Amino acid sequence: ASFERKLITRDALAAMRASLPAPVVFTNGVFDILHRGHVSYLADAKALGACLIVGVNSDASVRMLGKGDDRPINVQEDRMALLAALECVDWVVGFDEKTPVSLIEAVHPDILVKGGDYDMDALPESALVRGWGGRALAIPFEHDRSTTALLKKVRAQS
Amino acid sequence: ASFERKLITRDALAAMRASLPAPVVFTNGVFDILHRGHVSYLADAKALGACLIVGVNSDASVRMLGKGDDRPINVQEDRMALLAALECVDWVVGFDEKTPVSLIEAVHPDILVKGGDYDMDALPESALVRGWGGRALAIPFEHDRSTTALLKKVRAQS
DSSP states (O other), rough: OOGGGGEEEEHHHHGGGGGOOOSEEEEEEOSOOOHHHHHHHHHHHHHTTTTEEEEOOOOOHTTTTSSOSSSSEEEEEEHHHHTTTTOOOOOOEOOOSSSSHHHHHHHHHEEEEOOOOOOOOOOOOHHHHHHEEEEEEEEOSSOOHHHHHHHHHHHHHH | OOOOGOOOHHHHHHHHHHSSSEEEEEEEEOOOOOOHHHHHHHHHHHHHHSSEEEEEOHHHHTTSSSSSSOOOSHHHHHHHHHOOHHHTTOOEEEEEESSSHHHHHHHHEEEEEEESSSSSGHHHHHHHHHHTEEEEEEEEEOOOHHHHHHHHHHHHOO
């Protein structure tokens, strides 16, 4: 229950914003079932900055899109709790709207990241963040990294 | 990528054992699809000691027991990576034998913990761990309903 210290409300995160370590990194998603691409990317996003905030679609909100799952099999509190259990995540915030734009406006990240192959120029939130001089970028889900090759290289040795 | 520092082989962990913070806590499982009960359980296991090590059954190992489904949805390295990403987990080791008995022999944990109401006296590793002055105990673990589980597996497959 200790990782639950990361679950926070938009209002509380807004009050705390000024005291967060720069650069503040933001990402959002449904995160219905965590897989390795999710955590690999959650870790790299953390590595870009000093602080990582994850926005999580409410159950109603998730119902707003036809892209992914209309109805997530895990309730928003459970999806958020899993994220909070992660070493690389600092803060987990839910949002109800269909897009994370007003959440992002409130949070004011220095860096916005998306996991997957997504044209960042087609995203409203990219424009929002770049609008005040921040950065927006897509981090691929599974890519061959130097840190991976190395650590496992280490594994064979045994 | 940083989290992968936790994936290690039995031999290297055994050599490193003496310098780990005592008491060393051990638990093992398949951990196919993580849910909130898993992470709640792993945090409670961590709170029992100063260091947490997770034994992860190999695909092959999973084929030999009647727990859950005969086959897993995620390969061993993905299941181990998911666990290693958890804040509360310190070391993730994969074993190939039917049970974790030999691994526990090599690791020498000071505390063996299982989730659920399980007669610990019926486990060989309990006697083993108690035999060298360690502890073995069960702590409550919340399982997800079979339906949700079946829906989860399906989702994974998709």
